[PDB]
Design a protein around this ligand. Sequence first.
Ligand code: 4Q3
Length: 223
Amino acid sequence: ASLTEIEHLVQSVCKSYRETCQLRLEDLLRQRSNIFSREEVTGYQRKSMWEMWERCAHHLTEAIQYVVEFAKRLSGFMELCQNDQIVLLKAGAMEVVLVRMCRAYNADNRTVFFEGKYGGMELFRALGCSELISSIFDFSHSLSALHFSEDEIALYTALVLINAHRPGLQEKRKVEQLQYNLELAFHHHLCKTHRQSILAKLPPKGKLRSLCSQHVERLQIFQ
Ligand SMILES: CC(=O)Nc1cc(-c2ccc(N(C)C(=O)c3c(F)cccc3Cl)c(N3C[C@H]4C[C@H]4C3)c2)n(C(C)C)n1
């Protein structure tokens, strides 16, 4: 599986990402100045956990939808069997959602974009999940320091999803072979862009898994 050919793989992945990222980077950057007032924040803090949750769960389900679209446009993903398609999405999707959040986060003032404006962690107080929210803000913050280009995220999240060590896989070797080509592609694009430095700054092995184990833990869905 050759080199001119991983060059096309890099371009292609980067395109799928761009075609499924839901909010454009430009808009997020532009809207940074648009912050929630002291009153608009109080409004959100007054609502019940249940209304926050509805709003949050709808935004998540749309985001997952986009992640699933992204996967479906990566080379070879659609050629894997259905059970394997599912096992990779079930295991990675919310991890990708989480990494995609860092583009909507603003290290200047510890704020994130949500429903048309930018807001600190206190916006989400009726959820009663200060610990979890707070550790999402910290992961988003130490990711914002890498100044991850859009293409690096696309390649990195392609590797979040395409992972042959997910328990449950049945054609492991065909996943391995997609994963390998994607790893080379990321490496090679880092070398083309002089950005090899970022490989050592990326989430320690398992930081993402365990933040997702913790996140998936709220099924407020049950009620
Ligand atoms: C336009 C818009 O608002 N989009 C939007 C909003 C959310 C969104 C949707 C849901 C969440 N929250 C709050 C949760 O994922 C969540 C929950 F629903 C229940 C308990 C704990 C958590 Cl973190 C958050 N958080 C978590 C952390 C406070 C920041 C932003 C963010 N998303 C995600 C798909 C990226 N996209």
